[PDB]
Amino acid sequence: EEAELAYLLGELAYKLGEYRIAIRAYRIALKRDPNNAEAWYNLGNAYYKQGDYDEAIEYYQKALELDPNNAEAWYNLGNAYYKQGDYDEAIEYYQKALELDPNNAEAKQNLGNAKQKQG
Amino acid sequence: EEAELAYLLGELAYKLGEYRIAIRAYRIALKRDPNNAEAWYNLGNAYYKQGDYDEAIEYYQKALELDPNNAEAWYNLGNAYYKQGDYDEAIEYYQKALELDPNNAEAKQNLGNAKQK
Amino acid sequence: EEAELAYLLGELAYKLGEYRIAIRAYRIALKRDPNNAEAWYNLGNAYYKQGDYDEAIEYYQKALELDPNNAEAWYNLGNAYYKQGDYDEAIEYYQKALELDPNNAEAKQNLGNAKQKQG
């Protein structure tokens, strides 16, 4: 229904790089369905893509409280910490991402980058 | 009104090559308005664009039950059969398309291709 | 809520050059929220982009009754009259546009074009 339409609009907007429109659409989705883990996750991505890492972190966290079994969320949480030079936290979350999804090449590369920093 | 929004979102998604999103949106439109022939037709196109010809066929057929006088639907039904090498069926539907719309070149070209196979 | 969704869809469609979809979406938005000046304005732009200048004019006019302090709207109203050869009206609205936004060099150029077309 309308929340699903809002969600689809946000995804479409996101995929086309219209992050402000994605955010406004995901907000409508979340107003209607506040416990939608995937909407929080995607709102997080939209903020991430705009360089707003603190907001991304907050919404990734919210998504993971609702659904901790989202490997990609753990991974992006890692990235957002990495981009702020919080290498400890990035390492913790990349590792959690890999515990859930050992095949995430990207998380493995970034884990390695983060481990090499820190020092 | 919600059905129209769903439909517009599906068209937008389709036009931009986001077929999965188009399908999900058109399904919401059809849930609200199951007699919308153009939504069935477009759902068909979205599946066609993804290479899922059997599904495309099913939805083209549904669209044509609702609007049998719609030459473009007959034409796309033809194409979907053609892409699966069902040349007999493609010929029947291209011909039906042309019986309704003697112009539209494309169905005429494809009819010729199919007949040659 | 539905009005906002319709509006977001219209914006998204507009930004991507899908003007027919934008028009249909903005119509739904305005049906739900007829006092949205920015929706009237954008419906106007969508019709303008399609070459439907009489419709553009109608919706610009509506937008400006609701928000007269929108300089860019006065300017586009001017353009739409210009494209139909209503040079008097184009001149009046370009002038109004400049009274509100003296830095609109485009409106100044077009004002000059219109003044020339009419002798």
Numbering used by the authors:
A (entry chain A), C (entry chain C): 1 to 119
B (entry chain B): 1 to 117
Article sentences:
We sought to develop a general computational method for de novo designing protein nanoparticles with geometries tailored to present antigens of interest, focusing specifically on the prefusion conformations of the trimeric viral glycoproteins HIV-1 Env (BG505 SOSIP), influenza hemagglutinin (H1 HA), and respiratory syncytial virus (RSV) F (DS-Cav1). In the first step, we de novo designed antigen-tailored trimers, featuring N termini geometrically matched to the C termini of the viral glycoproteins. In the second step, we generated tetrahedral, octahedral, and icosahedral two-component nanoparticles by designing secondary interfaces between a designed trimer (fusion component) and a de novo homo-oligomer (assembly component). This design approach yielded nanoparticles tailored to present 4, 8, or 20 copies of the viral glycoproteins in defined geometries.
